[PDB]
Amino acid sequence: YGDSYFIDTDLNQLKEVFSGIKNSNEQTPEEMASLIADLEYRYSWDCSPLSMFRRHTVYLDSYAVINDLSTKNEGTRLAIKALELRFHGAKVVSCLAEGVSHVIIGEDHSRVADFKAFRRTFKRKFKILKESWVTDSIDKCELQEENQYLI
Amino acid sequence: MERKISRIHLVSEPSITHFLQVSWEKTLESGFVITLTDGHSAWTGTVSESEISQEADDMAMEKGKYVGELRKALLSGAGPADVYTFNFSKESCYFFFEKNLKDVSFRLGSFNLEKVENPAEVIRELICYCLDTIAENQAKNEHLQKENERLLRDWNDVQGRFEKCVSAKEALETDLYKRFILVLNEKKTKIRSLHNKLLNA
Amino acid sequence: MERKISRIHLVSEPSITHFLQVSWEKTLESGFVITLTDGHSAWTGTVSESEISQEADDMAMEKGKYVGELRKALLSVYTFNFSKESCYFFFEKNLKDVSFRLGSFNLEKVENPAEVIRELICYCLDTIAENQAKNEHLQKENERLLRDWNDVQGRFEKCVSAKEALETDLYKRFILVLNEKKTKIRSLHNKLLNA
Numbered sequence: 001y002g003d004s005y006f007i008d009t010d011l012n013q014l015k016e017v018f019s020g021i022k023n024s025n026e027q028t029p030e031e032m033a034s035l036i037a038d039l040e041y042r043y044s045w046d047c048s049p050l051s052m053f054r055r056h057t058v059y060l061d062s063y064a065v066i067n068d069l070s071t072k073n074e075g076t077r078l079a080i081k082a083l084e085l086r087f088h089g090a091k092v093v094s095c096l097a098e099g100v101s102h103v104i105i106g107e108d109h110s111r112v113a114d115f116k117a118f119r120r121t122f123k124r125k126f127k128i129l130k131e132s133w134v135t136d137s138i139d140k141c142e143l144q145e146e147n148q149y150l151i
Numbered sequence: 152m153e154r155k156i157s158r159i160h161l162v163s164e165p166s167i168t169h170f171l172q173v174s175w176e177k178t179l180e181s182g183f184v185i186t187l188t189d190g191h192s193a194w195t196g197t198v199s200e201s202e203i204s205q206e207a208d209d210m211a212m213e214k215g216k217y218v219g220e221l222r223k224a225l226l227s228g229a230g231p232a233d234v235y236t237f238n239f240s241k242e243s244c245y246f247f248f249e250k251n252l253k254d255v256s257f258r259l260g261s262f263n264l265e266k267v268e269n270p271a272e273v274i275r276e277l278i279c280y281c282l283d284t285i286a287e288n289q290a291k292n293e294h295l296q297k298e299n300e301r302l303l304r305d306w307n308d309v310q311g312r313f314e315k316c317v318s319a320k321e322a323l324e325t326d327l328y329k330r331f332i333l334v335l336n337e338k339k340t341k342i343r344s345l346h347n348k349l350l351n352a
Numbered sequence: 353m354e355r356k357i358s359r360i361h362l363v364s365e366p367s368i369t370h371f372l373q374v375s376w377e378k379t380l381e382s383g384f385v386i387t388l389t390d391g392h393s394a395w396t397g398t399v400s401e402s403e404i405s406q407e408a409d410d411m412a413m414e415k416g417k418y419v420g421e422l423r424k425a426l427l428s429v430y431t432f433n434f435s436k437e438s439c440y441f442f443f444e445k446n447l448k449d450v451s452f453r454l455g456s457f458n459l460e461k462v463e464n465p466a467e468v469i470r471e472l473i474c475y476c477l478d479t480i481a482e483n484q485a486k487n488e489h490l491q492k493e494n495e496r497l498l499r500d501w502n503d504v505q506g507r508f509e510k511c512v513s514a515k516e517a518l519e520t521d522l523y524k525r526f527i528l529v530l531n532e533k534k535t536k537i538r539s540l541h542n543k544l545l546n547a
Binding site: 305 | 357369391392465469470473476479481483484491498500501505507511514518522533540541544
Binding site: 003005008009010011014015043045048050051075077080083084087138141 | 305331
């Protein structure tokens, strides 16, 4: 490509080099995201303050029932939650598979009974934080340091 | 089943107030009952086969323009610019819905009225339906005010999110390009160093 | 100036209907007037100042059992026993092992049948007009705010999608150039080592 060992490419030259390289779709989104995460972790690029939810595929249980198309939650804030999740790179999923490692319910947290029942059943001990943490991305708009995770 | 409260005031006797309450029932094709009240006496309406037949065969309306006239004359649908002399003869107990259209009095409105079967069934219904209508008005007012507050707060939140995402994109393009330049320059330096070593290997 | 609306359930006899209509005005700090009207026979009586202070002092209990009970009676079970031969309205609060008399408002009867019906007609008409106007203003207000919300949702969604697409294709191009440089590094290492 246009990159040279004697003449370095500045912002504009690198932009032109990238544009000259044709852009298409040849890699699956899952594989491309996985390689992005691996490269970012290999040289500490995932620490960007705007994109940290690439690995954390948070499942939002916006559906009370399963496989029912006769209802539509109009005027609800679930779209706001989806936008907040996709701002940092997290993509929500509506179909359950084996790749989902987190289950998050909406403001209806009075369902602690099923969480208690599933703690004894599931060996995958889930982690549920307070709803203030997600609002901290708007109010504080700052990441949470690792010093909070202590004894 | 419903009472239509329409603002109306008599002209002949301003002290005595009567309501031109055309409380049409559901399935108006089946029929309707007129409701005129004064405080102590009421009146209703009946529908008969002969009455339906004469209504169909006398006025002779097939794809006409009487719906608007019904809405304006009976429900006072006209704007508060033209006064309608819908005076109910209290002394005669005769309601003639004559049309004072530019001071021309044809023989238009003259139909019989039926004796009320029970004034209670209309008086109680009116005094309960007015309260029910006020209560539901207050309820929908409160609910829509709450919805207005929710809309305002979510609009402000998503405007803030729009500003934040614009800033994030503007910083992301620049810092991504800078990181790419740094990585590629480091890789080029690695290539140059390895080539220099191989040149005198 | 306004009128309170409340619903009471009568287990014994539901075939007889009575409605309370008391217009509240002339606050108690300078005398008050209680007006009663069933919709057909109005009894407008003037209460006295000798039944306001002694009500909370005759039995000598907490004043809450009067002020709070009056406040929660308007904001919503009494048994209705109205004597037509005495023209006096009273009600007794009956519970299990608890019985405290509450209503002791003296009332009289008027003869005018036109003043009260005019007041009720004006009240209902004005309430209907004001609630319709306020409600209509509020539907229009919330509907164009919800249109603005829909527009801002759409523009935020498209802006976020554009940002994500730019991030994705920049990542794709950087990945391509990084793979190119990785292959170059591998080839140069092979040249340095094998040759």
